[PDB]
Amino acid sequence: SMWELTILHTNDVHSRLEQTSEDSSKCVDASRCMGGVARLFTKVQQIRRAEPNVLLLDAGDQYQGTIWFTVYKGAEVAHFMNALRYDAMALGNHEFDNGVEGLIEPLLKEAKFPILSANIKAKGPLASQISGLYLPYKVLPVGDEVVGIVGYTSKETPFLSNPGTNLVFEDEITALQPEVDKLKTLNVNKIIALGHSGFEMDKLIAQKVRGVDVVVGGHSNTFLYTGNPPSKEVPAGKYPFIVTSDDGRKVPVVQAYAFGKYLGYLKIEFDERGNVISSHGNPILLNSSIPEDPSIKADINKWRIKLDDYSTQELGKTIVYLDGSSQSCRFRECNMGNLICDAMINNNLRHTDEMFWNHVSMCILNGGGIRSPIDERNDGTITWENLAAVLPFGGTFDLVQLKGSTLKKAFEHSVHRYGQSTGEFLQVGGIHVVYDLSRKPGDRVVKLDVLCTKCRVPSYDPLKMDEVYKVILPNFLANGGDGFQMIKDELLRHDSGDQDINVVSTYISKMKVIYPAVEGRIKFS
């Protein structure tokens, strides 16, 4: 005898409540738009009506990405996930972006489903405050069986978000194994690991955590597919990805890209003792072939009324595609990066009253801070809402004095673990860098020319290690985010800047028509 479970799964939805363009920017041409919570609900109900044993799971990073989260601050997440009737969610890194209070009062108190993390431990006054609002696991009834779901969250969360110093983020394998053993002693024979640490960590969990039957992941924005993929996303492996564990077991690992563009869909056949005997499926592309549910869409429109103040005024026009996609901006020079760096540099030079920074022409910008493209095909209109999708974090473009050796160390860090879509890869202004990736990590920077400052005509001269340079960058990077510890430690001055999104809107308002290009600021050898 066999027992079939259908796992429906989203991850890194990142406040894409409404349907989006193919690239996850704002919907303009409705006939070609994709995803959003109303469309997901239609596909979820289609599966639920057909399959008797169904779990709808989220692997974190619902928080942050559009004006939805800027305005509603997680109430939209609670509300629409409840309307969809998610069975469980794992805490991601972006769930702590508005502090622990930003997690508790909107999401944890209003969610009608369990929220999960087994490697986040609470200490101090916070322990009693957050007791039971999230859990290490939940044991869910599914038909006449039970399925254990055990949660996890990235160890990098303190370095990427605002979880506060009373939350300790343990190792995933060390925290998960006792919980999985606890569930076995409670006669839960089917166990799903649901969490938010990336596809590599998901694979290690599948391997090393004995008793885990399936890993549903997130954080790396990984697309897995078996067969011919339905859109632009290139699959990193088959769906599901099969790990061979330490005790010889085949453990399926899944992820469902990002932005609610796909619904992950895995059918698993279990024996009577909760061993996986087979698995199959694929992520389902939520395109115009699936209608947005009328009820959920009507509710979305009601919540949408408050947001329409942010889409009113045209700040300017683009006549080129502003490529702010992760696949470009984390792997090579992207023109959205160039735009943002040029805006950073240009805005700073209006502050003529402050003479220490009035010649700053160099810029560094973490690629992962660029959160969305903007489309050029609607007479390429750029509103505030469009900008808020690119720059949702409410950071500042701060000013730092750095030694040359600090700067070379940062450019080595930029490509130290290249090829995994991590956000540390640097977009630049007033810098020409050339990488050779065949060299070992810490020695991949082969050419590095920067704009001179003690010179009448600015030209790109080679960077000297002993020389000091002035750079404009996100406060995230100045304070040591993305493992840029050399910046925070070794910087000589650090001034607070202007607000990031205001800098870019000012710049676009000034220029009227923008046309940034890929110029060979970042080259490969």
Ligand X SMILES: *[C@@H]1O[C@H](CO)[C@@H](O)[C@H](O)[C@H]1NC(C)=O
What are the start-end ranges of the H helices in 143-288?
157-160, 172-185, 199-208
In the complex, minimum distance from the CB of residue 275 to Ca ion, in angstroms, rounded to a whole number: 6
Closer to Ca ion by Cβ: residue 275 or 509? 275
Give the one residue of 213, 333, 398, 500 binding Ca ion; rule: CB under 5 A: 213
Of 49-57, 104-112, 186-194, 471-479, the segment contacting Ca ion by CB under 5 A is: 186-194
What's the CA gap between 415 and 402, in Å, rounded? 19
Cβ atoms of 223 and 179 within 8 Å: the answer is no
b/e sequence 230-240, b meaning 16+ C-beta within 10 Å? ebebebbbebb
* Interface with its own copies (CB under 8 A), residue from 64, 154, 326, 361: 361
The pairing of beta strand 262-271 with beta strand 396-403: unpaired
Strand partners, 398: 473
- Smallest gap from residue 12 Cβ to Zn ion (A): 4
Single out the residue of 131, 185, 289, 459 in contact with ligand X (rule: CB under 6 A).
289
Of 487, 498, 500, the residue nearest 401 (C-alpha): 487
Q: How far is the CB of 483 from ligand A1JCG (least distance, A)?
A: 9
Q: How many residues bind its own copies (CB under 8 A)?
A: 32
358 annotated to bind ligand: no
Contacts of 401 (CB under 8 A, 6+ apart): 468, 469, 470, 471, 491, 492, 493, 494
> Which H/E stretch holds residue 524?
strand 522-524
- Position 61 contacts ligand A1JCG (CB under 6 A): yes
Q: How far is the CB of 287 from ligand X (least distance, A)?
A: 4
| Region of residue 331 (left: phi > 0; alpha: psi -120 to 50; beta: else) | alpha
294 backbone dihedrals φ, ψ, rounded to 5°: -60, -40
CB 456 to its own copies: min, Å: 4
Nearest-10 crossing angle of helices 199-208, 172-185: 40
- Minimal CA–CA distance to 322: which of 266, 253, 372? 372
Q: Is residue 463 a contact point for its own copies (CB under 8 A)?
A: no
Q: Which is nearer to ligand A1JCG, 61 or 293 (CB)?
A: 61
Among 221, 222, 279, 338, the residue binding ligand A1JCG under the rule CB under 6 A is 221
The strand pair at 431-435 and 522-524 is best described as parallel
Residues 6+ away with beta carbon under 8 Å from 227: 282
Q: State both tokens at 14.
A: 């990142």
* Closer CB to ligand A1JCG, 296 or 390, in the complex: 390
* 332 in a labelled binding site: no
Which class for 132: exposed (0-12), middle (13-18), buried (19 or more C-beta within 10 A)? exposed
Interface with Zn ion by CB under 5 A: which range of 4-12, 354-362, 392-400, 515-523? 4-12
- In whole angstroms, give the CA distance from residue 172 to residue 120: 9
Nearest to 118 by CA among 94, 163, 153: 153
Kindly tell me which of 258 and 341 has the beta carbon lying closer to ligand A1JCG: 258
330 binds Zn ion (CB under 5 A): no
Query: Which residue in the set 170, 376, 467, 498 belongs to the binding site for its own copies (CB under 8 A)?
Result: 376
- For residue 418, the SS3 value is coil
Question: Would you tell me how many other CB atoms lie within 10 Å of the CB of residue 378?
Answer: 13
Binding string, 332-351, against its own copies, x = CB under 8 A?
--xx-------------xx-
Least separation, in Å, of the C-beta of 230 and ligand X? 4
Q: Is 166 annotated as a binding residue?
A: no
Tokens of 143: 């038909």
SS3 of 18-73: the string is CCECCCCCECCCHHHCECCHHHHHHHHHHHHHHCCCEEEEECCCCCCCCHHHHHHC
Which range touches ligand A1JCG (CB under 6 A), out of 40-48, 158-166, 260-268, 396-404? Answer: 158-166
Question: Interacting stretch for ligand X, rule CB under 6 A, among 66-74, 282-290, 500-508, 515-523?
Answer: 282-290
Closest distance of CB 291 from Zn ion, Å: 27
Is 351 known to sit in a ligand binding site?
Answer: no
Residue 42 near ligand X by CB under 6 A: no
CB nearer to its own copies: give 393 or 515: 515
Query: Is 371 a known ligand-binding residue?
Result: yes
> Which span (137-145, 156-164, 300-308, 453-461) binds ligand A1JCG, by CB under 6 A?
156-164
Q: Among 78-86, 244-252, 287-295, 397-405, which window interacts with ligand X (CB under 6 A)?
A: 287-295
Q: Please list every residue from 391 through 410 that binds ligand A1JCG, using CB under 6 A.
A: 393, 395
* Binding test (CB under 8 A) with its own copies, winner from 45, 232, 519, 525: 519
Per CB under 6 A, contacts with ligand X among 211-250 are 230
Among 195, 274, 395, 430, binds Ca ion (CB under 5 A): 274
List C-alpha distances in Å: 399 to 51, 59, 476, 478, 496.
56, 36, 12, 8, 7
Judged on CB neighbours under 10 Å (0-12, 13-18, 19+), 466 is exposed
Contact between 490 and 477 (Cβ < 8 Å)? no
Q: Is 32 annotated as a binding residue?
A: no
Task: Return the residue nearest ligand A1JCG (CB atom).
Answer: 423
274 binds, among ligand A1JCG, its own copies, Ca ion, none (CB under 5 to 8 A by kind): Ca ion
Query: Candidates 91-99, 230-238, 439-447, 489-497 — which segment interacts with ligand A1JCG by CB under 6 A?
Result: 91-99
Contacts to Ca ion by CB under 5 A: 189, 213, 274
Contacts to ligand A1JCG by CB under 6 A: 12, 61, 93-94, 97, 160-162, 219, 221, 258, 326, 366, 368-369, 393, 395, 422-424, 474, 476, 482
